[PDB]
Amino acid sequence: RPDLAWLDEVTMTQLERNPYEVYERLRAEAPLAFVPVLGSYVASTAEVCREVATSPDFEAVITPAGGRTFGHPAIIGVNGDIHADLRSMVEPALQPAEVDRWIDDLVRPIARRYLERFENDGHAELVAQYCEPVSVRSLGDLLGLQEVDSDKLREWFAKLNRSHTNAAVDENGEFANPEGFAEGDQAKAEIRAVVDPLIDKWIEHPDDSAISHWLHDGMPPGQTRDREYIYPTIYVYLLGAMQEPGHGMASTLVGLFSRPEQLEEVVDDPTLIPRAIAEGLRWTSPIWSATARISTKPVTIAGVDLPAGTPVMLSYGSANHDTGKYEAPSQYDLHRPPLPHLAFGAGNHACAGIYFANHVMRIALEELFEAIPNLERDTREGVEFWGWGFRGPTSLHVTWEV
Ligand code: HEM
Ligand SMILES: COc1ccccc1O
């Protein structure tokens, strides 16, 4: 678009390091805009992202690098009867009444286990030592992957993250970095080696694991869903569902450390943890720009006439800094009004795991502050945030008096 000629000089590295400056310009100049290096239109404001995600004239589409990573039928990329079946498949263990029955007994012992490894050290790097392991161990146990170590689940989500977000396209519209998908293919090959024997077992001997229920629930007697039909949703889980509660926890902690008086309020009154996490997710949204919708008819949005069949990436992390909606959105503020945010998306493809994820993060933070109420951020170490499609802190060094 003519007035956006500067977008041709935006690089993938710039977006990964810090997308907020480019997107601040997009929100003012062009809430719906084609970004050449991403090969796609992007929605940057709250109004546009919410309209696209909820519109009857759009449906889900996987991003280009997302499709190369996950294939079909990834739950994020399908619609109609297949999407309705996949949602019916994943929803039982995520239903709020079901989560409330067992979430505490799942997450709290796991948080205690990881805490005991470091709570008397006086220093820790909380992303690797706590946030990521609690997130992956909780979900891994729910899924039936009790025997897959947390380091391995963390390695898989990192590789899948890099493949899914390997979005850069060249001057011809072709992927600029095709070898960046190789580590995704490698992760998937390893996942298959580990998970295929578990599926073999669950087909004949169902148990209470969620993946066993994905095979069996709603199927006629003696039948299971084909493994090829469920694997792309397994992969979707082994990326975002494993990665995001850890990132959300960690971003919430960074934000609280940036407002020391608010950190103190939350440590003294842990009933404020849920509000702290909601602000954390708005402040640095873990899924920042990983999903998309495609138009099914011509539409006009934010002045742009789009033809049918036009993908639009939903940059919810930008929408969550919309200054039309928020005052000083780049500042973390526990006491912001409880406005809707888009960190779980919207519409029929909104996050299916919200209630689970919010309890994972809550319980992990409750236990952290009970164990180390005098946590302080190691402030000469910097908190680097990284990522355009998924965003979170790369490390979180903390210190405390033992
Ligand atoms: C803080 C943690 C999490 C955040 C911020 C988050 C955010 C999101 C977002 C932004 C999307 C895309 C929504 C859209 O395109 O409108 C999504 C999709 C999804 N999430 Fe979550 N997620 C989190 C954790 C989880 C967990 C732990 C699970 C599973 C237990 C999960 C299951 C799903 C599923 C199944 C979808 C696909 C929904 C669909 O396409 O129908 N999420 N999530
Ligand atoms: C829940 O996991 C995901 C959500 C959106 C995009 C990729 C994912 O793996």
Author numbering: 6 to 407
Sentences from the paper on this structure:
GcoA belongs to the CYP255A family of cytochrome P450 enzymes. Our recent characterization of a two-component P450 enzyme system consisting of a reductase, GcoB, and a P450 oxidase, GcoA, demonstrated that it demethylates diverse aromatic compounds, including guaiacol (which can be derived from coniferyl alcohol and represents the aromatic functionality of G-lignin that must undergo demethylation), guaethol, anisole (methoxybenzene), 2-methylanisole, and 3-methoxycatechol (3MC) with similar or greater efficiency than other O-aryl-demethylases described in the literature. However, GcoAB shows poor reactivity toward syringol, which can be derived from sinapyl alcohol via high-temperature reactions and represents the aromatic functionality of S-lignin that must undergo O-demethylation for further catabolism via ring-opening dioxygenases. In the present study, we hypothesized that substitution of GcoA-F169, which has the closest interaction with the bound substrate, may relax the specificity of the enzyme sufficiently to permit the O-demethylation of S-lignin type substrates.
The closest contact is with GcoA-F169, which forms a hydrophobic interaction with the C6 carbon on the aromatic ring of guaiacol. Each protein variant also crystallized successfully with guaiacol and the structures showed that the orientation of the bound ligand remained consistent with that of the WT enzyme. Furthermore, comparison of the surrounding active site architecture confirmed no significant deviation from the WT. Thus, the GcoA-F169A mutant, which showed enhanced turnover on guaiacol and syringol, is closer to the CYP255A consensus protein than the WT. It is interesting that although none of the GcoA homologs in our analyses exhibits a histidine at position 169, the GcoA-F169H mutant was stable and showed the highest specific activity on guaiacol.
